[PDB]
Write an enzyme that holds these catalytic residues in place. Sequence first.
Site, PDB file in Angstrom:
ATOM      1  N   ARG A 128       0.801  -1.212   0.000  1.00 28.45           N
ATOM      2  CA  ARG A 128       0.000   0.000   0.000  1.00 28.45           C
ATOM      3  C   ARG A 128       0.833   1.262   0.000  1.00 28.45           C
ATOM      4  O   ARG A 128       0.349   2.307  -0.442  1.00 28.45           O
ATOM      5  CB  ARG A 128      -0.954   0.030   1.198  1.00 28.45           C
ATOM      6  CG  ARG A 128      -1.984  -1.095   1.203  1.00 28.45           C
ATOM      7  CD  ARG A 128      -2.548  -1.380  -0.175  1.00 28.45           C
ATOM      8  NE  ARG A 128      -3.655  -2.319  -0.112  1.00 28.45           N
ATOM      9  CZ  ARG A 128      -4.155  -2.951  -1.165  1.00 28.45           C
ATOM     10  NH1 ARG A 128      -3.642  -2.748  -2.369  1.00 28.45           N
ATOM     11  NH2 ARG A 128      -5.166  -3.794  -1.009  1.00 28.45           N
TER      12      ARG A 128
HETATM   13  N1  LIG Z   1     -10.852  -0.970   5.605  1.00 25.97           N
HETATM   14  C1  LIG Z   1      -9.976  -1.474   4.719  1.00 25.97           C
HETATM   15  N2  LIG Z   1     -10.193  -1.382   3.406  1.00 25.97           N
HETATM   16  C2  LIG Z   1      -9.342  -1.880   2.510  1.00 25.97           C
HETATM   17  N3  LIG Z   1      -8.217  -2.506   2.833  1.00 25.97           N
HETATM   18  C3  LIG Z   1      -7.877  -2.670   4.117  1.00 25.97           C
HETATM   19  C4  LIG Z   1      -8.756  -2.153   5.153  1.00 25.97           C
HETATM   20  N4  LIG Z   1      -8.202  -2.446   6.323  1.00 25.97           N
HETATM   21  C5  LIG Z   1      -7.069  -3.097   6.047  1.00 25.97           C
HETATM   22  N5  LIG Z   1      -6.863  -3.235   4.746  1.00 25.97           N
HETATM   23  C6  LIG Z   1      -5.695  -3.890   4.123  1.00 25.97           C
HETATM   24  O1  LIG Z   1      -4.981  -4.606   5.116  1.00 25.97           O
HETATM   25  C7  LIG Z   1      -3.760  -3.961   5.460  1.00 25.97           C
HETATM   26  C8  LIG Z   1      -3.729  -3.805   6.967  1.00 25.97           C
HETATM   27  O2  LIG Z   1      -3.002  -2.643   7.277  1.00 25.97           O
HETATM   28  P1  LIG Z   1      -3.156  -1.967   8.692  1.00 25.97           P
HETATM   29  O3  LIG Z   1      -4.534  -1.445   8.783  1.00 25.97           O
HETATM   30  O4  LIG Z   1      -1.994  -1.029   8.798  1.00 25.97           O
HETATM   31  O5  LIG Z   1      -2.982  -3.288   9.564  1.00 25.97           O
HETATM   32  P2  LIG Z   1      -2.740  -3.385  11.132  1.00 25.97           P
HETATM   33  O6  LIG Z   1      -4.040  -3.831  11.647  1.00 25.97           O
HETATM   34  O7  LIG Z   1      -1.713  -4.442  11.244  1.00 25.97           O
HETATM   35  O8  LIG Z   1      -2.290  -2.034  11.550  1.00 25.97           O
HETATM   36  C9  LIG Z   1      -3.797  -2.617   4.775  1.00 25.97           C
HETATM   37  O9  LIG Z   1      -2.526  -2.259   4.256  1.00 25.97           O
HETATM   38  C10 LIG Z   1      -4.784  -2.785   3.669  1.00 25.97           C
HETATM   39  O10 LIG Z   1      -4.093  -3.267   2.536  1.00 25.97           O
END
Ligand SMILES: Nc1ncnc2c1ncn2[C@@H]1O[C@H](COP(=O)(O)OP(=O)(O)O)[C@@H](O)[C@H]1O
Lengths: 542, 523
Positions: B390
């Site tokens: 991302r």
């Molecule tokens: N609401 C969402 N919509 C689309 N993709 C998501 C969403 N939440 C997570 N992802 C995907 O999963 C990955 C989880 O990243 P992040 O939210 O930073 O995870 P963590 O929970 O480990 O902090 C993101 O980089 C994205 O690619």
Amino acid sequence: PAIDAGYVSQVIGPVVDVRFDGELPSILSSLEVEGHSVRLVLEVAQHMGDNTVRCIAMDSTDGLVRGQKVVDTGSPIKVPVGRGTLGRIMNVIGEPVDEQGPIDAADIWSIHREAPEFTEQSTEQEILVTGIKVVDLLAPYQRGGKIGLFGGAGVGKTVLIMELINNVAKAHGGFSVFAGVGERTREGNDLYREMIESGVIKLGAERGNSKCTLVYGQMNEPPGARARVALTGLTVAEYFRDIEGQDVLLFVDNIFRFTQANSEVSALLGRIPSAVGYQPTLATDLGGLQERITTTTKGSITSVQAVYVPADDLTDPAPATTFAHLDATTVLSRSIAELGIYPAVDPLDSTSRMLNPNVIGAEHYNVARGVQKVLQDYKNLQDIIAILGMDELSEEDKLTVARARKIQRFLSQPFQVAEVFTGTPGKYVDLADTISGFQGVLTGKYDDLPEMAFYMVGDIKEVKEKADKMAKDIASRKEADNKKVSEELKDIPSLDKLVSEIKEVVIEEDDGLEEDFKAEALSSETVVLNEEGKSVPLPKKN
Amino acid sequence: ADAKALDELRKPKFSSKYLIQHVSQKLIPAVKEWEKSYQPPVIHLGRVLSVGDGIARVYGLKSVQAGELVCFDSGVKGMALNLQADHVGVVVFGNDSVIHQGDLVYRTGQIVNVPIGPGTLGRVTDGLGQPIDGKGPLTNVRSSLVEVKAPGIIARQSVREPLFTGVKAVDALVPIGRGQRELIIGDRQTGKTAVAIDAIIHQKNCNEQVPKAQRVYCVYVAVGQKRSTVAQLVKLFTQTGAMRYTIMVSATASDAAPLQFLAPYSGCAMAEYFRDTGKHGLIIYDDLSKQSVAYRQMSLLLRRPPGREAFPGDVFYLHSRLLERAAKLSKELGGGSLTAFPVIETQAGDVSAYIATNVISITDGQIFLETELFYKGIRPALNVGLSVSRVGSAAQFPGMKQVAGTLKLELAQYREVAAFAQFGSDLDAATQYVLERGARLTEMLKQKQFAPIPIERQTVAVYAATKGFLDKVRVQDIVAAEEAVISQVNPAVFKILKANGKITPALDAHLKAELRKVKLPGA
Ligand SMILES: Nc1ncnc2c1ncn2[C@@H]1O[C@H](COP(=O)(O)OP(=O)(O)O)[C@@H](O)[C@H]1O
Ligand SMILES: Nc1ncnc2c1ncn2[C@@H]1O[C@H](COP(=O)(O)OP(=O)(O)OP(=O)(O)O)[C@@H](O)[C@H]1O
Ligand SMILES: [Mg+2]
Ligand SMILES: [Mg+2]
């Protein structure tokens, strides 16, 4: 100058022992180390017993010698609080790490205090509308309550916590504190830069019109700094609650890293370890921090905390202890994310205390309990659907699987912070559109539509907008042969004329590696120090 | 027995000196007859009290810094981990069989160093920077600390530039930005090194085509590998010419566990030379899962309490403080970057293990390499549904971003339609368009080893597949249709797509025109 100035007696990683010749510092006192390359403060953790204190370094200890002078500041770590800290980034010890000059402070509060008393608690439940369908329906958030987002490394609890910053924290009208505890420094730079272009943080002479203050103790910090940076994020949030008397939003990214940093330290404080390998004091270390994050009778703190679960284990004692400290737990699952459903919220594991018919109303409550009932009965079927298939189901049960596949997709929605990598623009769904939309799928008003029309849409107006498009596409797919803009003479030059419009760049051939570099003349022998500190070659014996 | 009662014994309270005066005239004659049995006393030097398990306990060393290089008289380096009140515990960078009780420990006066500079480029060094390629010492080089703190929030900027892997599945679907760390995670024997080697070979092809400030200088850290694998890899980099830009840091499986633990910090410090001077680095930590096993050995031999899977509590901080140094710096710090590729080996596809989920919480994306796709011959076996980037998306090639949105989507439908019915219940004509286009694009993305593709030949090949131009070939000759495409189109069409960056509408229907006059092998 002699007494109340102790010396470093032993260094074991993040843990320093200082021996004081008289008048030991109190436990939780801050101790400065003289002669270090950076400012090294040490928080006194234990009195060891022979005029020795055991203390935790808030920075790196590589460089400490066993005689180094340590002065006592006579007080805990005291960080700048007030309206002057808004729009600034502080670290664990209150230093500005945003290069914007010194933080002018209304006060300098110590980061250690007790919880508000039992007479100081406020028992009021009004809802916090987040614009997220699965949150506002099934586990709705309380406006002064504690909210936990439970996650397992990549399931989406930073995207969810940035969406709550986007949805809730602009229509809130109060101050926000973002305490980043042990997460990525790239994400600290992303939030800081995206708050400047959002006007949440204003730089320069308009700094006082900022709405957010950032405290960052990210995952490159030593475990003493990550074990205390949640406490200096609360102290900034507690000043706005107690003194300024207003409503704060505290966003703590990965409060698990507070527990993990104390667990790295606790091995070296000479403690017998508890279950899985954690500190014996896990529940009271976390309890003493979480009980400070409350709504009192003078102000409010709406606290959203990301909680990492290790190895996707929700019975791990650092996730398992946190569950009791929260009014609303939003559990994000990995299997929900592998079906492409985002936010990956487990609908049958997320819980609020606001899901109560006397709090949210009986129309909201019966939809949430009816949504959970068909999702649970579908989960009871999934052992048979895997083996026997859907052909062996009763047609009463096929209506369950058809409906529960539909609301499973309808709980997902696009985010306005995820549009930058998914392409889909994000949808804020109001609470009234959430309740009526899921009530239609439970009564059966939308069994016409296919199950992919419900996927990544805002409200029930838009599943009908998307089902119409799905039907229309299955008819119109091609017949784009020619008489479009692809004519070879109208809009299009010669191909070899395009070669000459290339600005050819010059290539320097020499790699530019020895333009400023100064090489230390490394010796042919190991250079060491003899008994008098002189740079001497290594002598020849063993 | 309190210290109030013990500090009264400072002041004299004997009032009778008939034994103080007697032995003060016989003590120095007594010590003089036992001098060939005294080892000379030690205050600023050290003497080894205990050695074993790869940890020495050193008496003396009154002014060692915490965590500095000490040197045994055998020539072995150590690192003063814990300074205690009576001894210093050092961890031996090498074999502990050559350290004895009674040996002198000398102080180097410096926290642990590796040689960094331009003259470390080209070389094969060990976990401590000492070169093992046999071609001399490192010259044109200077020492730097291996435990630098990562740059903070204000020293960074957003990830804007693309790091082209040359791997077709990677640079299309999981594109890597230039200051971004990206995990390569998969089982044993799944092409994890081959993705990282193809990235290093590809940067060599691009450094002769970019104007000296956009040159990527790769660093490969091999932790726990076989020494024959490392020597076979140095030969591959030497014969492709990639060692001109590559540092090869090697702490193999026979080396001491503190050398394997230190080798990724040693190699990160050599790659941080290029981050700090405005150049661009590429660091590969091959099996960071082997570096945590080496660190688990040192922590259990230091009798520190084990946690989950017997790893220490700070095994997250082991990797997080390392991978945080892979940053894109801001323009007042030079604008340099360092992009990391940690490699994690996974047991039976279990991504929810301890060290695997730690590095997923640290890095920005993953490249999941499935064992089942690797057995079907789909190589690189990129699990498209699980591999993420991302930070690198919206930092990729603008021409590839046009054509891969359809590629990710037609693969998103292909996984979703293949989820419904792989066995022949009933086949729609609309879904057998998806299985015909999905198997077209899967054969499109699989490429063979040690030949990375430029990004302009990679955009055209996916342009020829997400659009029409390949539906004639069934599934088999699509690999042969690609060199039928990329060799038969006019090689000027790769020059305009490279220099503009994207597909202009002038080049759009020019490239439709060149893709209609290519002769396809499936006829
Ligand atoms: N609401 C969402 N919509 C689309 N993709 C998501 C969403 N939440 C997570 N992802 C995907 O999963 C990955 C989880 O990243 P992040 O939210 O930073 O995870 P963590 O929970 O480990 O902090 C993101 O980089 C994205 O690619
Ligand atoms: N893209 C590819 N095309 C064809 N063959 C490949 C490809 N990638 C790897 N291979 C072969 O598959 C094997 C995988 O090797 P590689 O070292 O890349 O995997 P690895 O995951 O690093 O394995 P290990 O964990 O044993 O080091 C090698 O023998 C390699 O030659
Ligand atoms: Mg996160
Ligand atoms: Mg390998």
